Symmetry: none
Subunit: 109 residues, 2 copies
Amino acid sequence: NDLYINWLKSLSFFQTNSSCAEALVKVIPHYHNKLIDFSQVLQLVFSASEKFPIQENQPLPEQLMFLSNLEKQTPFAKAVGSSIYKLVTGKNLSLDFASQILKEASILE
Amino acid sequence: NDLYINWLKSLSFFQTNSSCAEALVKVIPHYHNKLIDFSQVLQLVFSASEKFPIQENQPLPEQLMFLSNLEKQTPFAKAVGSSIYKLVTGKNLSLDFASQILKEASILE
């Protein structure tokens, strides 16, 4: 709620991409009005991102060990890991970087 | 009520998707037994939709612009818009098309 949002704002990935902030500021209202849900907030916020290590054609075994691990995460971490995985497949976001964002959120929760 | 059901059945999105029609059939009983409200009926029914335009990747601006417009809609139109936005973000349902569906429900109301 206000909780998952704070945790989101606590993320280092979030803090290094000012575009994500300008996004959360302009999206959080519709989340308060119950127009959209947290999953949507994350997709909309992380879609504005633009700065992160890139790795093309990342190996399948690593991808799968990241997903088996994400599959076992706690609520908040899972939603973030999954949203970020979108960036890994569609924008080549380095898998290790994703693994760190997940680790970090894994702790905040 | 036996008014929203009719408004729902009036939407082209509903008429062009027989799947939504079947859904409504299986879902409405729980609505009558009062386990779910109509906003829920809307979500469930639309989750069954299959036919619609898929605009992949819609710039954040367009999104926020559609949400603030949805924000000031009437009750039924707000409910219909919110359920459809789920598809927008989760299935890349065209924002234009979405706007259309929302206009039509805005009218019936």
